[PDB]
mmCIF file with all atom_site columns, C-alpha atoms in Angstrom:
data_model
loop_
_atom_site.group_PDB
_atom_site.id
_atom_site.type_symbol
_atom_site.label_atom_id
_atom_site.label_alt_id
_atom_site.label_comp_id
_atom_site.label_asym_id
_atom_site.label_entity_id
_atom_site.label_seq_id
_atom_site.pdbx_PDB_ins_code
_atom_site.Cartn_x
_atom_site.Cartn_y
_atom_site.Cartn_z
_atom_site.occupancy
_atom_site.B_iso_or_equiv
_atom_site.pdbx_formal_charge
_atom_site.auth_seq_id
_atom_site.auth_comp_id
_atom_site.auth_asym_id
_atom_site.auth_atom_id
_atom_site.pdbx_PDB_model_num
ATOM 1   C CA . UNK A 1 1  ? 2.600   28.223  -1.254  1.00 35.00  ? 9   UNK A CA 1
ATOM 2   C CA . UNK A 1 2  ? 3.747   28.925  2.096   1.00 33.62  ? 10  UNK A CA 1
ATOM 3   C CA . UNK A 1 3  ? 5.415   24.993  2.892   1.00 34.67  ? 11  UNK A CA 1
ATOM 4   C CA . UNK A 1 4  ? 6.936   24.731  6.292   1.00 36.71  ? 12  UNK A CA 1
ATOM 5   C CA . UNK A 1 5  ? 10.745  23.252  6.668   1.00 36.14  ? 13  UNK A CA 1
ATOM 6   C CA . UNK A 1 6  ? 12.031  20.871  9.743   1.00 38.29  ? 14  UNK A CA 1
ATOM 7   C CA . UNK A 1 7  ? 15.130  19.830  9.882   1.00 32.57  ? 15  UNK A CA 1
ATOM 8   C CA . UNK A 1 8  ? 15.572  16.955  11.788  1.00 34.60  ? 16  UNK A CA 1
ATOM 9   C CA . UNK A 1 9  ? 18.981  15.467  12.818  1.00 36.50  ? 17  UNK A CA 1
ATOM 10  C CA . UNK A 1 10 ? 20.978  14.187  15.832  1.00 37.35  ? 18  UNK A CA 1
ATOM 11  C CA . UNK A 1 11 ? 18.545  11.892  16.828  1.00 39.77  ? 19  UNK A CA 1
ATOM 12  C CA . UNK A 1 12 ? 17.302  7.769   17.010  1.00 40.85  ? 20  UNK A CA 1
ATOM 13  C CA . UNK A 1 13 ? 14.625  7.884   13.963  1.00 39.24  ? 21  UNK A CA 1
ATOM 14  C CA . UNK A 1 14 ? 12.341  5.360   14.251  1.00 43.44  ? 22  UNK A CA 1
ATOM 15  C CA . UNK A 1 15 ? 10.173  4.568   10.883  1.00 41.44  ? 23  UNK A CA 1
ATOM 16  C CA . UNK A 1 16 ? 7.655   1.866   12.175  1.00 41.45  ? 24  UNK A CA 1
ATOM 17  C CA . UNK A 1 17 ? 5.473   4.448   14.846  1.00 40.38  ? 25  UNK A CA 1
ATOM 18  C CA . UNK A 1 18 ? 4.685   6.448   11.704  1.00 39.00  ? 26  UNK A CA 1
ATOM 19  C CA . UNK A 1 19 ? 1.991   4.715   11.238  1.00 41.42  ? 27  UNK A CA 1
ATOM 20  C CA . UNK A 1 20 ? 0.386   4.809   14.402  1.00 38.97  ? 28  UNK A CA 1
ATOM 21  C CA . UNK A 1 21 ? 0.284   8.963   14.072  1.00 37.81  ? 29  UNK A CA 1
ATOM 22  C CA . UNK A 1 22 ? -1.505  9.825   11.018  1.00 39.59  ? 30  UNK A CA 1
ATOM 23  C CA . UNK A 1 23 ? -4.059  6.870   9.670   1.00 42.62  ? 31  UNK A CA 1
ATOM 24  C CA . UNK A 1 24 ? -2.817  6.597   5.826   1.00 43.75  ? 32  UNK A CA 1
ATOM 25  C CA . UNK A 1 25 ? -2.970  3.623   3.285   1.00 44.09  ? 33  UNK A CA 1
ATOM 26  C CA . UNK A 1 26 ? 0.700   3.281   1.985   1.00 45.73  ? 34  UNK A CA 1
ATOM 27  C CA . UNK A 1 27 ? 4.195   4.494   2.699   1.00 46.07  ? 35  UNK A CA 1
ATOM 28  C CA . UNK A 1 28 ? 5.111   5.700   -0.910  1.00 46.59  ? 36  UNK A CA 1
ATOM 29  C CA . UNK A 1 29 ? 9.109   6.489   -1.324  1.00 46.90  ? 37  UNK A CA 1
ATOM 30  C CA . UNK A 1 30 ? 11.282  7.086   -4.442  1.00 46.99  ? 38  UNK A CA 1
ATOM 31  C CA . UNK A 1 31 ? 14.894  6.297   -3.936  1.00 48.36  ? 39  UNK A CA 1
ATOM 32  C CA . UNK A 1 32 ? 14.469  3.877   -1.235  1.00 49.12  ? 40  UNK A CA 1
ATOM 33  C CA . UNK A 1 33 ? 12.118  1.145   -0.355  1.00 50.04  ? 41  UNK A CA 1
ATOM 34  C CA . UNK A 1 34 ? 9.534   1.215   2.374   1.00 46.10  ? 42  UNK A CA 1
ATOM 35  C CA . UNK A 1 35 ? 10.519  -1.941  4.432   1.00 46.71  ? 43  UNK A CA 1
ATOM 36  C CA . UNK A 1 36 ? 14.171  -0.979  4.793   1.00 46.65  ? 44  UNK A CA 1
ATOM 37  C CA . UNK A 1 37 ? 14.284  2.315   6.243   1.00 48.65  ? 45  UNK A CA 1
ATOM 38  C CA . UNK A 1 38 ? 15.528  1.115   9.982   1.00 48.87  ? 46  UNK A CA 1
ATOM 39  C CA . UNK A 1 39 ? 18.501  -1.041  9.077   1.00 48.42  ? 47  UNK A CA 1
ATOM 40  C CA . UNK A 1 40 ? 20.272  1.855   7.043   1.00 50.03  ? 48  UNK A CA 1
ATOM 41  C CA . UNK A 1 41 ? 20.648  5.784   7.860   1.00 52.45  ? 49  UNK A CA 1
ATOM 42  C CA . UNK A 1 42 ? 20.930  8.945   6.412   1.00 52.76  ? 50  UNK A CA 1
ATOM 43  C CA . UNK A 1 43 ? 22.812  12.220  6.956   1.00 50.84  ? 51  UNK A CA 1
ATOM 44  C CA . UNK A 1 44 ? 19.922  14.450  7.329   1.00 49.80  ? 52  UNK A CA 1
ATOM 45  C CA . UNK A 1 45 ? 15.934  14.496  7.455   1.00 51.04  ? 53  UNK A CA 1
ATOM 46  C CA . UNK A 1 46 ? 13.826  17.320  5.786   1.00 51.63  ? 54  UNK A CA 1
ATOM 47  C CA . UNK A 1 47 ? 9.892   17.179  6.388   1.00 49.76  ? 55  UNK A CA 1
ATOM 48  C CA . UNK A 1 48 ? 7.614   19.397  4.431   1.00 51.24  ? 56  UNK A CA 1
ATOM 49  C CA . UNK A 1 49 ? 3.548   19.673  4.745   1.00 53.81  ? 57  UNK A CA 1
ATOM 50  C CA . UNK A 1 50 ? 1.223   21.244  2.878   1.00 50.78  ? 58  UNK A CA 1
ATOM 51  C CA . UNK A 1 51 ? -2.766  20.533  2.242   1.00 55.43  ? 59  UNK A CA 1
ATOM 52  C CA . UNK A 1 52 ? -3.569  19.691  -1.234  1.00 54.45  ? 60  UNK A CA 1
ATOM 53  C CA . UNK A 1 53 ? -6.634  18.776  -3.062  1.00 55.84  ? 61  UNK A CA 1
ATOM 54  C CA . UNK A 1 54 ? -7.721  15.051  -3.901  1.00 58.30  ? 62  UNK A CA 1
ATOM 55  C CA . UNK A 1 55 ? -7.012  15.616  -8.248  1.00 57.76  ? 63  UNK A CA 1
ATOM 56  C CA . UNK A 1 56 ? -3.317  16.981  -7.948  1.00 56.53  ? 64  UNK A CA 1
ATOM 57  C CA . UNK A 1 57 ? -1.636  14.302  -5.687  1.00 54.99  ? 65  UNK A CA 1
ATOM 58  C CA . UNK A 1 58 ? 0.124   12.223  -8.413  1.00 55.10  ? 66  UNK A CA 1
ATOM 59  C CA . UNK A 1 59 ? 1.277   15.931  -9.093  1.00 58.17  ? 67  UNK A CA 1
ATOM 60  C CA . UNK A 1 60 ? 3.923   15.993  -6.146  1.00 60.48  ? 68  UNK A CA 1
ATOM 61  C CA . UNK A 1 61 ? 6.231   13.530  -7.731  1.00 58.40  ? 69  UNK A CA 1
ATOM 62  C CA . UNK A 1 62 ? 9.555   13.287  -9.546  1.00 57.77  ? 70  UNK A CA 1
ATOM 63  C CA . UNK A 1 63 ? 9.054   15.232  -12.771 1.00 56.84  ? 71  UNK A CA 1
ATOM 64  C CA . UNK A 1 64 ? 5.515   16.328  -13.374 1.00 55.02  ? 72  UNK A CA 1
ATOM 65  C CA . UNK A 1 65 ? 3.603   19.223  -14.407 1.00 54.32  ? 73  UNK A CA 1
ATOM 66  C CA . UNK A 1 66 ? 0.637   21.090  -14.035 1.00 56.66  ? 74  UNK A CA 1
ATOM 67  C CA . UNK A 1 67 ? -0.077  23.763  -10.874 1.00 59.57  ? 75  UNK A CA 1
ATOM 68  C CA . UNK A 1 68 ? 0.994   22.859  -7.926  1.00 58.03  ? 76  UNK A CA 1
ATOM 69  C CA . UNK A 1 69 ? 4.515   21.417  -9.742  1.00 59.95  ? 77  UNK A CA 1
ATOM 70  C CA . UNK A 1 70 ? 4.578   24.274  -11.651 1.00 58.52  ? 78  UNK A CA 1
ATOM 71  C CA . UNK A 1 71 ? 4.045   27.405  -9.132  1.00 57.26  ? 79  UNK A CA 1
ATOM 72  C CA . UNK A 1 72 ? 3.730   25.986  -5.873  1.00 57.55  ? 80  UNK A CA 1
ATOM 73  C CA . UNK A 1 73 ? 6.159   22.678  -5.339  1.00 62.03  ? 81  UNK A CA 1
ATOM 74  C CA . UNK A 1 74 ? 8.135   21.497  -7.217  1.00 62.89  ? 82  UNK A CA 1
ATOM 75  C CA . UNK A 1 75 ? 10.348  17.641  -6.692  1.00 65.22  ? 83  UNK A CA 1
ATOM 76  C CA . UNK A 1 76 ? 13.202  17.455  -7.763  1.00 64.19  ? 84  UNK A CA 1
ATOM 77  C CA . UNK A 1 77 ? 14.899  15.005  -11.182 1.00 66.22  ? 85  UNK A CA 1
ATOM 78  C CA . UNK A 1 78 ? 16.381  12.620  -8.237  1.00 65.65  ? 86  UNK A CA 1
ATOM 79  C CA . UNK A 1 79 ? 14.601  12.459  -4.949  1.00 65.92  ? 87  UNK A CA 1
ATOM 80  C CA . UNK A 1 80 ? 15.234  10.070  -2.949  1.00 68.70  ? 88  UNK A CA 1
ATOM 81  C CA . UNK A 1 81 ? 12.617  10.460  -0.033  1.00 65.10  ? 89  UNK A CA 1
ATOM 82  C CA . UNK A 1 82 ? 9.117   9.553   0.901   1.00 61.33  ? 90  UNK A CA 1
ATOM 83  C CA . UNK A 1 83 ? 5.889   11.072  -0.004  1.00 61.04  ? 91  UNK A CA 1
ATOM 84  C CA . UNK A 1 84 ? 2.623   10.502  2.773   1.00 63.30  ? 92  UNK A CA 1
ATOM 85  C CA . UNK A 1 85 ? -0.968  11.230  1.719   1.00 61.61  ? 93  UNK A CA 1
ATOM 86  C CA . UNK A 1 86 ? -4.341  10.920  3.564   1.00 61.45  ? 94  UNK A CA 1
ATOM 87  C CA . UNK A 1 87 ? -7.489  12.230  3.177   1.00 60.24  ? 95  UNK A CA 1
ATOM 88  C CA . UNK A 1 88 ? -8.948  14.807  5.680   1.00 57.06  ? 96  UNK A CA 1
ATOM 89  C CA . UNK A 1 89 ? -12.322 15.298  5.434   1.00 60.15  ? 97  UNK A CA 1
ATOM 90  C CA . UNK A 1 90 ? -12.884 15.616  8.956   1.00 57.28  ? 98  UNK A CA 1
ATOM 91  C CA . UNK A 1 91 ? -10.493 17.856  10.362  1.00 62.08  ? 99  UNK A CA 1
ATOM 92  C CA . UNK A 1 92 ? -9.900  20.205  7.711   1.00 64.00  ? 100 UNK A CA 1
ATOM 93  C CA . UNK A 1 93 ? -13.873 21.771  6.100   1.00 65.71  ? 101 UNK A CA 1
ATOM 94  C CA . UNK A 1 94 ? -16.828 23.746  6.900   1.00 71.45  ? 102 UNK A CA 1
ATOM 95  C CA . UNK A 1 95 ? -20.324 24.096  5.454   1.00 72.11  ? 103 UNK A CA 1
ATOM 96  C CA . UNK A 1 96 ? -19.691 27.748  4.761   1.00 72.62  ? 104 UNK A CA 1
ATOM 97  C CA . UNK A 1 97 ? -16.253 26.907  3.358   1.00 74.45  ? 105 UNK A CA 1
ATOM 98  C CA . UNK A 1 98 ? -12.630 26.511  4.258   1.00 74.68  ? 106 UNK A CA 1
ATOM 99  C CA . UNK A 1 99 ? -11.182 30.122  3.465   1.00 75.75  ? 107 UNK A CA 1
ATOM 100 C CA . UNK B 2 1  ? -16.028 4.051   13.437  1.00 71.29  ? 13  UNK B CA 1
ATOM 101 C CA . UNK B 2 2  ? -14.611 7.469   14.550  1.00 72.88  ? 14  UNK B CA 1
ATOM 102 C CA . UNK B 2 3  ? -11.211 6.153   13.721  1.00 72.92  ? 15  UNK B CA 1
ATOM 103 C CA . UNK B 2 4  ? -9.674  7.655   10.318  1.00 75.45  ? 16  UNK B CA 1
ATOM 104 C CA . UNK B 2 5  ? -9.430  5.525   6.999   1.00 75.03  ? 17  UNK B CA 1
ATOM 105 C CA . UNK B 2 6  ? -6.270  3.900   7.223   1.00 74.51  ? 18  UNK B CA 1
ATOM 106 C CA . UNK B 2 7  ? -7.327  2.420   10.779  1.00 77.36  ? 19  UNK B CA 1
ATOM 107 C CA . UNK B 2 8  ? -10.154 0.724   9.418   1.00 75.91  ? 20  UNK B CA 1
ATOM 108 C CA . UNK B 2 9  ? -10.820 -3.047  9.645   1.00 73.87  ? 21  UNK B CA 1
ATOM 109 C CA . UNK B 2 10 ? -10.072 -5.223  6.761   1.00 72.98  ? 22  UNK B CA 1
ATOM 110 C CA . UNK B 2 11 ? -11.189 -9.004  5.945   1.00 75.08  ? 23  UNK B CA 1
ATOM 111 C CA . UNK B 2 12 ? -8.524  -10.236 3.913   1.00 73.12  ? 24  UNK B CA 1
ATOM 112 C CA . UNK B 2 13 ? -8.719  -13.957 2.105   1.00 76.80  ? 25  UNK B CA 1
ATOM 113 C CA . UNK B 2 14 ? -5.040  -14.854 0.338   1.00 80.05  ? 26  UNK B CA 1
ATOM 114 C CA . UNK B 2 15 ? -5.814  -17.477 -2.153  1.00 80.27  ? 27  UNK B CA 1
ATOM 115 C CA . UNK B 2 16 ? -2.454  -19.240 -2.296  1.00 80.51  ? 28  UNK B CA 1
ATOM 116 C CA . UNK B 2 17 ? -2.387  -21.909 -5.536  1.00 80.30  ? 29  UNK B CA 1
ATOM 117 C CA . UNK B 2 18 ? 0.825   -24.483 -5.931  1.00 80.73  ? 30  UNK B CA 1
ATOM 118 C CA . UNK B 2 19 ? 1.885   -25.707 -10.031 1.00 86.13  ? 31  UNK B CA 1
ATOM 119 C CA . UNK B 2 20 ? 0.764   -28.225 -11.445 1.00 88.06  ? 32  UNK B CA 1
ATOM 120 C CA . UNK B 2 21 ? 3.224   -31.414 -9.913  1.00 88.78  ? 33  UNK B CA 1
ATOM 121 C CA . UNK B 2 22 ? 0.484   -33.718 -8.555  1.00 87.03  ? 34  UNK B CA 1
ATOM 122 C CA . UNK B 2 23 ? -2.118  -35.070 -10.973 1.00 85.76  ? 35  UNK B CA 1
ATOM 123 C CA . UNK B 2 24 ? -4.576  -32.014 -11.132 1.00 86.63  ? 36  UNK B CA 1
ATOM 124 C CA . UNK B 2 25 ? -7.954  -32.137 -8.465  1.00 86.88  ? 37  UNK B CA 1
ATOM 125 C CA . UNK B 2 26 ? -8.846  -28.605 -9.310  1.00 90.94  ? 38  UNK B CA 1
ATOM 126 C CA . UNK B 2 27 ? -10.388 -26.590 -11.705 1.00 90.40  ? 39  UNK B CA 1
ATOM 127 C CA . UNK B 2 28 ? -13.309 -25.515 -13.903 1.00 90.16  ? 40  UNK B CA 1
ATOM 128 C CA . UNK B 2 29 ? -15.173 -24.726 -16.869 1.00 90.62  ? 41  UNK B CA 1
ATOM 129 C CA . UNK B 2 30 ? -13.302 -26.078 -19.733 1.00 88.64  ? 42  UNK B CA 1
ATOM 130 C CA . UNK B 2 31 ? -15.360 -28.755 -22.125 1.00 91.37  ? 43  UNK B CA 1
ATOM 131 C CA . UNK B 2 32 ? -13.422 -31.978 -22.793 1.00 93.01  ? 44  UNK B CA 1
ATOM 132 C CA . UNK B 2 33 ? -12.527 -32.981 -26.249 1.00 93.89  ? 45  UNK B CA 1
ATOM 133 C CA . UNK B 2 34 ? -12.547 -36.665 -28.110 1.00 95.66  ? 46  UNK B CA 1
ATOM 134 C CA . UNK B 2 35 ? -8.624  -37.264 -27.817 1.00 93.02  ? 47  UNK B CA 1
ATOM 135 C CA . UNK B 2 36 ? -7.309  -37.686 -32.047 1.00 95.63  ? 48  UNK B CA 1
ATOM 136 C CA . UNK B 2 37 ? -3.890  -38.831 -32.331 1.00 95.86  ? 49  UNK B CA 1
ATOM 137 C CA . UNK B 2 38 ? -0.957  -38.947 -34.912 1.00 98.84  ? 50  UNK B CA 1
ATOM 138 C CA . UNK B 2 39 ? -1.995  -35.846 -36.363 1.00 100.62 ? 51  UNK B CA 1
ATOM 139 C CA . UNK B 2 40 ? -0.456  -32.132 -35.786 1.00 100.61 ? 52  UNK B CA 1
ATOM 140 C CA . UNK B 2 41 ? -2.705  -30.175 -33.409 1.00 98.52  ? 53  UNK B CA 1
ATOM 141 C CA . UNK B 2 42 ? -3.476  -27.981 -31.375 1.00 97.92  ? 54  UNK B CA 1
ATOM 142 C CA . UNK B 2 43 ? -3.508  -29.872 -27.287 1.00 99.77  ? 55  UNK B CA 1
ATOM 143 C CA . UNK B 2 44 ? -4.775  -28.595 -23.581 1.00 102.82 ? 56  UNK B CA 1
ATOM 144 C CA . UNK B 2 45 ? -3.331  -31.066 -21.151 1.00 101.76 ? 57  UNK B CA 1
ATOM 145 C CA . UNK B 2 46 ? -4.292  -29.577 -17.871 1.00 105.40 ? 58  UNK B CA 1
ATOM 146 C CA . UNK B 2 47 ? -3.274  -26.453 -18.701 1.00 103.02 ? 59  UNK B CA 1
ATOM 147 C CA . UNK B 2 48 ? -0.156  -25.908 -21.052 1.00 102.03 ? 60  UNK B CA 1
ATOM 148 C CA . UNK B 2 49 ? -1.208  -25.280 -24.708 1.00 102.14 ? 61  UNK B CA 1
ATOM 149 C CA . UNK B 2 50 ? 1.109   -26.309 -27.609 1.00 101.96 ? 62  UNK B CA 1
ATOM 150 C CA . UNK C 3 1  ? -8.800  -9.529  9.643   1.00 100.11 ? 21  UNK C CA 1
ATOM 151 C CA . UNK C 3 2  ? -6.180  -6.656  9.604   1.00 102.64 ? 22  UNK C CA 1
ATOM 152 C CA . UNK C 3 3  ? -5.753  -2.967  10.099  1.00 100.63 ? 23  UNK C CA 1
ATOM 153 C CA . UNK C 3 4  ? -5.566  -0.655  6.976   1.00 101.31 ? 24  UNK C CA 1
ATOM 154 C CA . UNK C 3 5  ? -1.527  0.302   7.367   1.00 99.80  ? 25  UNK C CA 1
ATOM 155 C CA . UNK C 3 6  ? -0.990  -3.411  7.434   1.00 100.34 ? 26  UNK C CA 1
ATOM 156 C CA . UNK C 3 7  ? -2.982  -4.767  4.149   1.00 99.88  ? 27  UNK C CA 1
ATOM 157 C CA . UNK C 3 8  ? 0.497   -3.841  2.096   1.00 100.94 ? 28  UNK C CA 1
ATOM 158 C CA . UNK C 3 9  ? 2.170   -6.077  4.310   1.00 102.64 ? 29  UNK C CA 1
ATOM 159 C CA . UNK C 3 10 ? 0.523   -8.919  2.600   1.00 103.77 ? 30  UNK C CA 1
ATOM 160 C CA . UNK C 3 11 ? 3.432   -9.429  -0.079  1.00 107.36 ? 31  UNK C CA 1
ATOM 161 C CA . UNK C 3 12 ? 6.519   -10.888 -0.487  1.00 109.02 ? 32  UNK C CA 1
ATOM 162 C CA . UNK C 3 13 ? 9.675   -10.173 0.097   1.00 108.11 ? 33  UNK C CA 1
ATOM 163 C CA . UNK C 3 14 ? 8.598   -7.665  3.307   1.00 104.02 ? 34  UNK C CA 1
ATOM 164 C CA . UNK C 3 15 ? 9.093   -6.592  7.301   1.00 103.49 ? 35  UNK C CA 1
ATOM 165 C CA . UNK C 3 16 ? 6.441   -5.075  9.744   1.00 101.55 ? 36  UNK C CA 1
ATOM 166 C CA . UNK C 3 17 ? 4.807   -6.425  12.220  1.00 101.46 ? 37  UNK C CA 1
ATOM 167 C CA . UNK C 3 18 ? 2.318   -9.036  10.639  1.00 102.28 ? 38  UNK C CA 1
ATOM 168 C CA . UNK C 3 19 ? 5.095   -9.600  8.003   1.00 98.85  ? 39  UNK C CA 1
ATOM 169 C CA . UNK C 3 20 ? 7.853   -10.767 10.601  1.00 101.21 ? 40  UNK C CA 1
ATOM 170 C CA . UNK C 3 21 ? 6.146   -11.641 13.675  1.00 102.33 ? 41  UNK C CA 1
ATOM 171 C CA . UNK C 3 22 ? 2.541   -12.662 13.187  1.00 101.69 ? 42  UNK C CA 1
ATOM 172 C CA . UNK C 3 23 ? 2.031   -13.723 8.619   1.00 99.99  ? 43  UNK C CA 1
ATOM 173 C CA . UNK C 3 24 ? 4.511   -13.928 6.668   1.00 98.25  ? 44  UNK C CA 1
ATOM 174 C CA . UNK C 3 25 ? 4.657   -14.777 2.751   1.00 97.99  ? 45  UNK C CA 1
ATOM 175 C CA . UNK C 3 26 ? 7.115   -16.872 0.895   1.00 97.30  ? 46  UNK C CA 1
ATOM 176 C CA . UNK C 3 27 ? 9.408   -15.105 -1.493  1.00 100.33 ? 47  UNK C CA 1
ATOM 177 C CA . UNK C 3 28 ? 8.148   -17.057 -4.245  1.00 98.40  ? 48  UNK C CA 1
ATOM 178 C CA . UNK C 3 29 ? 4.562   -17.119 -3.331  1.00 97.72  ? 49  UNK C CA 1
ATOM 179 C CA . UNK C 3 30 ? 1.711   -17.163 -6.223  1.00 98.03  ? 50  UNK C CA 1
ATOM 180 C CA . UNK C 3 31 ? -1.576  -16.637 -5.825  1.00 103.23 ? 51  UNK C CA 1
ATOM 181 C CA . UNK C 3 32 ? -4.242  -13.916 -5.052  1.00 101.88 ? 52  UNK C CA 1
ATOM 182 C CA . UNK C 3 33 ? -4.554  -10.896 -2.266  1.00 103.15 ? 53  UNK C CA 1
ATOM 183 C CA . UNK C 3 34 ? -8.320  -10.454 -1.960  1.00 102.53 ? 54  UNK C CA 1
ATOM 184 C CA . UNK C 3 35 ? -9.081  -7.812  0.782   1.00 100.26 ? 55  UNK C CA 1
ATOM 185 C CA . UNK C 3 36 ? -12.254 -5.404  1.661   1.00 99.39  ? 56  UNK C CA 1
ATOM 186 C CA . UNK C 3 37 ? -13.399 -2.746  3.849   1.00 98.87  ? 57  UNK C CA 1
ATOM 187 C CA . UNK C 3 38 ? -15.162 -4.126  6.770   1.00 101.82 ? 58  UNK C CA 1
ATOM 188 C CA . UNK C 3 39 ? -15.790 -1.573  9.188   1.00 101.57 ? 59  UNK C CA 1
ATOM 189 C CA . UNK C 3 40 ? -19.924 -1.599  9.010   1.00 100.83 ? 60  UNK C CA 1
ATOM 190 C CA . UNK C 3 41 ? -19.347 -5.763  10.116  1.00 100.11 ? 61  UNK C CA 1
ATOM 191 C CA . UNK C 3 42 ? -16.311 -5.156  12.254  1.00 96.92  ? 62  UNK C CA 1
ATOM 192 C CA . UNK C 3 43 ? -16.810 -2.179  14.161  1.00 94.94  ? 63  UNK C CA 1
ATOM 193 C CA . UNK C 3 44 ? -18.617 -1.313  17.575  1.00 95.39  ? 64  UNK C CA 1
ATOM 194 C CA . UNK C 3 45 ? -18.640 2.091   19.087  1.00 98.54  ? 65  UNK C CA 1
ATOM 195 C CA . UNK C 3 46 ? -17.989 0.868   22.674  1.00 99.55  ? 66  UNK C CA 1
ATOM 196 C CA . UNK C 3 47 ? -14.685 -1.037  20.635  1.00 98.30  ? 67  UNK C CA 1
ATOM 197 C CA . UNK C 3 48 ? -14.270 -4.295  19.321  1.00 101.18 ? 68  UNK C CA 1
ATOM 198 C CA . UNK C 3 49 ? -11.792 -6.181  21.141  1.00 101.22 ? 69  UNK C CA 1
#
């Protein structure tokens, strides 16, 4: 509910130590592909995060509904970014419960 | 093996075939039929029905 | 045997690192991708190397 915004601009981007950070499966994007990102460039970046359950991930995509498209975050008709998920199990819940 | 998922290792085998050019070596379970000729029907020459 | 990141880099038609440098596809490559977990048979927790 509560998504946090970084601009990021001015600056050498470098797409292929992204996957040395976080351990994910696939680089999914929209509006361009994933193996061309270095060649071309962009007028500005926007990142986003936000922690999500395992059901509603094909949720954050271009035109769906249900909650978290509906109340929470929504895509837009035309984006033309890149959308990262990974699963967390270890960093991120507690026998009691993550509150 | 503390490492997360997408740092895991991965065996990979890439079975990479080539078309039918060469007379055929390879293949499998596909029972051979009495060749009858000057007749219209149905044919399986290595693979390519018509 | 490959990392996890780099088992979409088996296809055609891509970049990377195994892709350029170290296995690379033909654009008009047929056949079949067959690839597993293997981290109970190639793992150590000293490191594999």
């Amino acid at each position: 509910y509560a998504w946090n915004r970084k601009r990021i601009s001015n600056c050498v981007a470098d797409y292929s130590v992204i996957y040395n950070f976080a351990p994910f499966f696939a680089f999914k994007c929209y509006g361009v592909s994933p193996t061309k990102l270095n060649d071309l460039c962009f007028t500005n970046v926007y990142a986003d995060s936000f922690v999500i359950r395992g059901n509603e991930v094909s949720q954050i995509a271009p035109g769906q509904t249900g909650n978290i498209a509906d109340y929470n975050y929504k895509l837009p008709d035309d984006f033309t970014g890149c959308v990262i998920a990974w699963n967390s199990n270890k960093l991120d819940s507690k026998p009691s419960g993550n509150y | 093996p503390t490492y997360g998922v997408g740092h895991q290792p991965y065996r990979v085998v890439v079975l990479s075939f080539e078309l039918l050019h060469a007379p055929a070596t390879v293949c499998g379970p596909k029972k051979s039929t009495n060749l009858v000729k000057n007749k219209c029907v149905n044919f399986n020459f290595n693979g390519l029905t018509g």
